Paper text:
In the human pathogen Staphylococcus aureus, c-di-AMP is produced by the di-adenylate cyclase enzyme DacA, which is thought to form a complex and be regulated by YbbR and GlmM, two other conserved proteins. GlmM codes for the essential phosphoglucosamine mutase enzyme, required for the conversion of glucosamine-6-phosphate to the early peptidoglycan synthesis precursor glucosamine-1-phosphate. We determined the atomic structures of the S. aureus DacA and GlmM enzymes and show that GlmM readily binds to DacA in vitro and blocks its activity by masking its active site. Specifically, our data suggest that GlmM blocks access to the active site of DacA and in this manner prevents the formation of catalytically active head-to-head DacA oligomers.
Two key interacting residues in the dimer interface are amino acids N166 and T172. To potentially disrupt this interaction, we mutated these two residues to lysines, yielding variant DacACD-K. To “lock” the dimer conformation, we also mutated these residues to cysteines (DacACD-C variant) to facilitate the formation of disulfide bonds between the two protomers. To further assess if the DacACD-C variant could form disulfide-bridge locked dimers, the purified protein was crystallized and its structure determined. The protein crystallized in the same dimeric conformation as the DacACD protein and electron densities consistent with the formation of two disulfide bonds were observed for the DacACD-C variant, which were absent in the DacACD protein. The WT DacACD and DacACD-C variant had similar elution profiles and eluted at a retention volume as expected for a DacACD dimer. The DacACD-C variant displayed very similar activity to the WT DacACD protein, suggesting that locking the dimer through two disulfide bridges does not influence the activity of the enzyme. The melting curves for the DacACD and DacACD-C proteins were sigmoidal, which is typical for well-folded proteins. Taken together, these data show that WT DacACD and the ‘locked-dimer’ DacACD-C variant show similar enzymatic activities, suggesting that the stable dimer we observed in our crystal structures will likely transiently interact with other dimers to form higher oligomers for catalysis and c-di-AMP product formation.
Residue numbers in the entry:
A (entry chain A): 110 to 259
B (entry chain B): 111 to 260
Amino acid sequence: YSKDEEKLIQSVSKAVQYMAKRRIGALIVFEKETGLQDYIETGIAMDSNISQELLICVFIPNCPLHDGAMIIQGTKIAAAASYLPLSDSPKISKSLGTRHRAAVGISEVSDAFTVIVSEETGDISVTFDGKLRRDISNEIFEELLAEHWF
Amino acid sequence: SKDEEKLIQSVSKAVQYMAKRRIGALIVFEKETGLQDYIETGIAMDSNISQELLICVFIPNCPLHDGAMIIQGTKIAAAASYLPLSDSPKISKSLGTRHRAAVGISEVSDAFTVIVSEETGDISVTFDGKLRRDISNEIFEELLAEHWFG
């Protein structure tokens, strides 16, 4: 892995851990092969470089960009506050936030890789290919982020 | 010029919103004098400009609210940049440091800087070494257009 590719992962990883401990809900979608320009246009265009600080700033509660999904295209944030499709599978708990139903939702209609931070639990969750992995450790998140991103 | 009038509206509407809520803000737009020296002081963004993103950067306690946002052309080159503070004896000493930061970058370059006072909520501007205080919103858009797009 490139030195920069690792810098990005620690940036994203450090941001997720900050939000995890403070129970800040967060929802970040990483584009893979399926084009997500339909969903990127849902929100406010950023086309911005990544840094931990930006990631945290976007999800601050009572912030204009916290409501919705941040969508990442390659090494850039394509948009924030995107509306993703919500999922209807009856196997989602219903004790689970809209963010979670959105991430499995986008997981059903594309190959995208999405990380969710539960505003109520602080657990780190991941979705891809219609499948959900819940309450992963930081080590596993960095492991999985790298595979799907790079 | 249509694209410019929407950028001016983006910047102007955000500045007024922060003004009414007494949110401190400090934004410098570069013209002729390169600031890449100061842009490297802060967090690299290279981000498109939008009303929501300007406001999110300066929400109090946001990791980027402390410092200067620097704008290059139609993009935000960096946020939370360190500008040099000025030592002129006509400065109130009755004003937050944000004011003296804009008078600082005004002395060493031709840059155009806007300030929103955290304690007062008034709108100020600096260029060519002098500070102009509590201008109206109508006047602020006129000067921004003048200095940003010639």
